[PDB]
Write a protein that binds this ligand. Structure first.
Ligand SMILES: *[C@@H]1O[C@H](CO)[C@@H](O)[C@H](O)[C@H]1NC(C)=O
Ligand SMILES: *[C@@H]1O[C@H](CO)[C@@H](O)[C@H](O)[C@H]1NC(C)=O
Ligand SMILES: *[C@@H]1O[C@H](CO)[C@@H](O)[C@H](O)[C@H]1NC(C)=O
Ligand SMILES: *[C@@H]1O[C@H](CO)[C@@H](O)[C@H](O)[C@H]1NC(C)=O
Ligand SMILES: *[C@@H]1O[C@H](CO)[C@@H](O)[C@H](O)[C@H]1NC(C)=O
Ligand SMILES: *[C@@H]1O[C@H](CO)[C@@H](O)[C@H](O)[C@H]1NC(C)=O
Ligand SMILES: *[C@@H]1O[C@H](CO)[C@@H](O)[C@H](O)[C@H]1NC(C)=O
Ligand SMILES: *[C@@H]1O[C@H](CO)[C@@H](O)[C@H](O)[C@H]1NC(C)=O
Lengths: 369, 369
């Protein structure tokens, strides 16, 4: 390899952007700026955008990637159907797919994921419930698939003396849903939704007087740190959730400041909420791929050829690289990155946060081990 | 229209076949044999087979169907991923998709389905549980998506004093799973799996002494009537499940006898288990489409043009035909066929059956209304 090339697929239709493209560039720059002994091949990241909601588009994008000679494909972060199409094609060609968003809910060739598994999210929520003395609860789901995502927790409630009252937004305003929860007179409300939908639910809850001291909320979104509930919350609250960020990572300041400058070219600096987790996962993903490829390269000569959608040819090194990906131990923006036999993150933590008027406080940690 | 043409997609990799191809021919023959006043256009059914487990294949099959000038696409019955690809392409081209297998779990343009909805299956199971005085239970799932398919029942257990212990086969032999259920010492076992997997679970249960009078089974498969548990069951049992068949339908004898001759060209007449429900749903589907098209044709002139995967052209009549499909009232092999505003079967029944040494007995009825 004259260069170590990977592809990344972005799907970002937000007004301000999540900054994944810049995050990828920052990882590449950081890695290429460190001259190693022996010298290593330059890292390249080819970036492709998804602008429609179309698996035709996603398939065509993969067909454009295969001829470029890549050692991995990253993402997309926020498009589960597209990520499944990517995983399938990557599996057929034996190119590693590096996943950076939620487990697809509900494949032979292996992939890895930097995003916490569904089981881990369930266990983290259950840890907070243990802290509440294992109460009855209500669950608000953005999508019906929540019962699958949270199957571990659901199975626990199904055999426990406590109850779980489940309600789906699917489809406009959560107010009638929240009024039913209020009538049940149960304190603990679990919200399984992305950040914007979670904000909407909390806003409507606040308006109904449901952010009083009686009620306790647990959110599943890993973008909790960017959820700003100004005007809803005081300096202390009962609104809990998670973060993966290690703000002490040596690159974290440059990362935040750089993404702030990314944000403030389409929007105002004052509205930058902090770095998006998906951007940090993409940064970390580049390092994981580079680490694995350089370790594989000590024991075997790695080459790439054009692959194609119109050929049954596979990448001969993909099986090997999947095993070396599973050997990676990397300290990233998102904490310790290591993988288990299923390609899932292991030996890591989630910080448990409580929302406040200006941001949050950390009040505990969930350990995957 | 000189002819009324629809397409049907088959995916059948069974040794003996389910007889869907013959079922389609029988419907076409029956309809074309009735000379109406005024005379109506001849019915044609173009048949396509899926032989791989590939959405590339399914998409290519749809691309072959679009130029043929069809008024609907039927199926496939037993291939959920392929049926979803078909629904998507049909929706893009505004051609009705007539579904004949389980609700996909977890679309703008409307479709209809002749197969009972997930909610209806949950409600039918809950009706049997009411008959058992609403006990605690165990659920054996072939796939994790069972919690979604049975979400209505799961939500009921989550708020009830009774427990539900859920276990997934996902992945070889159910024996260890059944031993855990045995240790829980709960009587009622719900099996959500297709017919062959359900048979396997009951066989292993029998071997463990778990088909004694203490245990009660409820199966979700609509192919219960073809599940032959010879050697497991006596003349009476506690093994319950469902059938859609109306064995008094005037065509039922010809249907059974004809599919018996279909079966016994690849296998032995003695191993023919009776007609497969998917074959009967395909037969009924042809009648539903013909009924709707001939009613639409009273009020508007229907034409077809070649459509194509490489064109954005839609079928101008698809919206109209979807509304007329929803007006159909048809008495079929699978009972009364009518649709609600969601395109789901309504105003119908499921017969509740108890397995016996030679077959079954009907012991009750579930009404959708
Ligand atoms: C493989 O190692 C050799 C020598 O140590 C180096 O020249 C080459 O750039 C390496 N390739 C990669 C992908 O880092
Ligand atoms: C965060 O990064 C700092 C600095 O590299 C490191 O000392 C620490 O172990 C990291 N923390 C976690 C939880 O991974
Ligand atoms: C973004 O940059 C602005 C301008 O320098 C700064 O005031 C603000 O606090 C930054 N936001 C964050 C979250 O770092
Ligand atoms: C888990 O990760 C920590 C760093 O966060 C590391 O020090 C430790 O060696 C790992 N432990 C195991 C059991 O691998
Ligand atoms: C539409 O009705 C006319 C006359 O009643 C008939 O000739 C024609 O075959 C009909 N078309 C279909 C699709 O049945
Ligand atoms: C079964 O078919 C017979 C004969 O057409 C009909 O009388 C009866 O209503 C049908 N039964 C049901 C439940 O639809
Ligand atoms: C199939 O046909 C055979 C031969 O006539 C007959 O003995 C058998 O009972 C039939 N099976 C069924 C289920 O009707
Ligand atoms: C429901 O179907 C039955 C036939 O099974 C039919 O007689 C009846 O008119 C229908 N009832 C309603 C409310 O549509």
């Amino acid at each position: 390899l004259s260069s170590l090339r990977m592809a990344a697929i972005l799907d970002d239709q937000t007004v301000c952007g999540r900054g994944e493209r810049l995050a990828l560039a920052l990882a590449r720059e950081q890695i290429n700026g460190i001259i190693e002994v022996p010298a290593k091949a330059r890292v390249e990241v080819d970036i492709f955008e998804l602008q429609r909601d179309s698996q035709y588009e996603t398939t065509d994008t993969m067909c454009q990637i295969l001829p470029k000679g890549v050692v991995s494909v990253l993402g997309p972060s926020s498009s589960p159907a597209s990520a499944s199409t990517v995983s399938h094609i990557c599996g057929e060609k034996e190119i590693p797919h590096i996943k950076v968003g939620p487990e697809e809910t509900p494949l032979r060739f292996a992939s890895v994921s930097l995003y916490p598994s569904n089981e881990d999210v369930s266990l983290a929520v259950s840890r907070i419930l243990k802290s509440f003395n294992y109460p009855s609860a209500s669950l608000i789901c953005a999508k019906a698939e929540c019962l699958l995502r949270l199957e571990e927790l659901v199975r626990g409630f199904l055999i426990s003396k406590e109850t779980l009252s489940v309600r789906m937004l699917d489809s406009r305003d959560p107010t009638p849903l929240l009024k039913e929860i209020r009538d049940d007179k149960v304190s603990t409300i679990i919200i399984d939704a992305n950040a914007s939908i979670s904000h909407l639910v909390l806003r409507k809850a606040s308006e109904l007087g449901m952010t009083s001291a009686f009620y306790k909320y647990i959110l599943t979104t890993m973008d909790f740190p960017i959820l700003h509930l100004d005007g809803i919350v005081e300096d202390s609250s009962n609104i809990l959730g998670f973060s993966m960020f290690n703000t002490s990572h040596p690159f974290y300041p440059e990362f935040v400041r750089s993404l702030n400058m990314s944000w403030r070219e389409n929007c105002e600096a004052s509205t930058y909420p902090g770095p998006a987790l998906s951007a940090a996962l993409m940064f970390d993903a580049v390092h994981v791929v580079v680490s694995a490829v350089r370790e594989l390269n000590r024991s075997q000569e790695i080459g790439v050829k054009p692959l194609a959608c119109t050929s049954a040819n596979i990448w001969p090194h993909g099986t090997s690289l999947m095993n070396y990906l599973r050997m990676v131990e990397y300290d990233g923006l998102t904490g310790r990155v290591e993988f288990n036999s299923k390609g899932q993150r292991t030996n890591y933590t989630l910080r448990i946060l409580e929302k406040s008027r200006q941001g949050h406080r950390e009040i505990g940690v969930w350990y995957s081990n």
